[PDB]
Amino acid sequence: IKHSKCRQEFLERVKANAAKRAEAKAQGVAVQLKRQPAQPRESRIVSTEGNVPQTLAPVPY
Amino acid sequence: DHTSKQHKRSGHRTAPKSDNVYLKLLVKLYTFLARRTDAPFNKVVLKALFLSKINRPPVSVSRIARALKQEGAANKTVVVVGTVTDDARIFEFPKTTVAALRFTAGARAKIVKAGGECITLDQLAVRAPKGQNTLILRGPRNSREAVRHFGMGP
């Protein structure tokens, strides 16, 4: 009386595992087909030339 | 904490419960061979020496006749750990070598009459230290009167 989404999403992800592996067999290169969780982000230089950080001073009441 | 229980016991046996003298000599011989020759045959036989009367069911001599019908196995020396019993239902029996503990006098006659020789387990290790060219049979266990371990739906 239902039908399921999440399995049909897995069935589309197997097709992605075929084409990546078939391409990487042609041009010799690593596959990396396992998923990963979220990762901590990297270092990035942030320039405050556009916008000066404004002070807050938590007064209101 | 404790993830698992506690001091467990490996539920398997390490020594046979029998007080037979001659059986402990065969346990003494195969504990030598299993430690040294490292072929996986001896660990299977040594585990099979500790078993009870019920876990060693009798292998009928018609069951050895089935094992020689297999393709490319007409000269393997069959190894039974239990007893080999007679069976007068078959009529034509092969010529191979049987290695076992006990031979019933009806099954003793049928192998020697056909031509093959019957050999005990000490002469098995003298012939086959690694247990090359061997073939292990085990009798049936659910043919025992275990029709009675119950449920509402059988």
């Binding site: 901590p40 230089i45 942030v46 | 904490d1």
Partner: protein
């Protein structure tokens, strides 16, 4: 017979080719760690000169230490504490930081204290309190040939190679960490610092995240 001294002279000579790999590879590590920290310090200085704010990358290795003892623990955290191999009180393992393991620590946060360890404490935990799990049984290291016989498949063939896969988290972090038995630590030698432990570290207590002050606390427990 033979082999009176004929094989010993070659077997001792074979280890001379073995120690030569370890000596020059650790030179490549010591060059890397000092160039790692110089480039970060230069990155802040080059950003202040250009008027920019150099943020750091987030740390990717925490070190979790159990604090509360063994009983009166609810069922949701007690399963999570067993998955990090943190059975007994004052024990510790290294945890790779993802989205997944950050939510595990977020459950057991009133029981553990964790932060980001430096190279110094990792060098001092592996040498003094490091043990190895060899087919079972927790064998202490005391030798490079023990690691080389068990992690030779994965690269690693000296004890500093084990450290390098811990701090510079590599592809083989999971297999190199699971080789380590969980650390057995004493009570801290100076004290916990504060009167009560079971408040948050922001509120003076001991549990929670402290991000650098784990390096002062482990050296007492080391």
């Amino acid at each position: 017979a033979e082999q009176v001294a004929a094989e010993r002279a070659a077997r001792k000579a074979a280890n001379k080719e073995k120690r030569a790999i370890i000596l020059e590879r650790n030179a490549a590590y010591q060059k890397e760690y000092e160039t790692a920290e110089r480039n970060i310090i230069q990155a802040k200085r080059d950003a202040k000169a250009a008027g920019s704010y150099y943020v750091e990358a987030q740390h990717k290795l925490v070190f979790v230490v159990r604090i509360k003892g063994i009983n009166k623990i609810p069922p949701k955290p007690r399963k999570v504490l067993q998955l990090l191999r943190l059975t007994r009180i004052n024990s510790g393992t290294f945890v790779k930081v993802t989205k997944a393991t950050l939510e595990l620590l977020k459950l057991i946060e009133p029981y553990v204290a964790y932060g980001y360890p430096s190279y110094s404490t990792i060098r001092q935990l592996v040498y003094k309190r490091g043990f190895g799990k060899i087919n079972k049984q927790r064998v202490p290291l005391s030798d490079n040939a023990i690691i080389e016989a068990n992690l030779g498949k994965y690269g690693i063939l000296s004890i500093d190679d084990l450290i390098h896969e811990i701090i510079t988290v590599g592809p083989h972090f999971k297999q190199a960490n699971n080789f380590l038995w969980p650390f057995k630590l004493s009570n801290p030698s100076g004290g916990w610092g504060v009167p009560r432990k079971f408040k948050h570290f922001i509120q003076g207590g001991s549990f929670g995240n402290r991000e650098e002050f784990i390096n002062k606390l482990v050296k007492s427990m080391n």
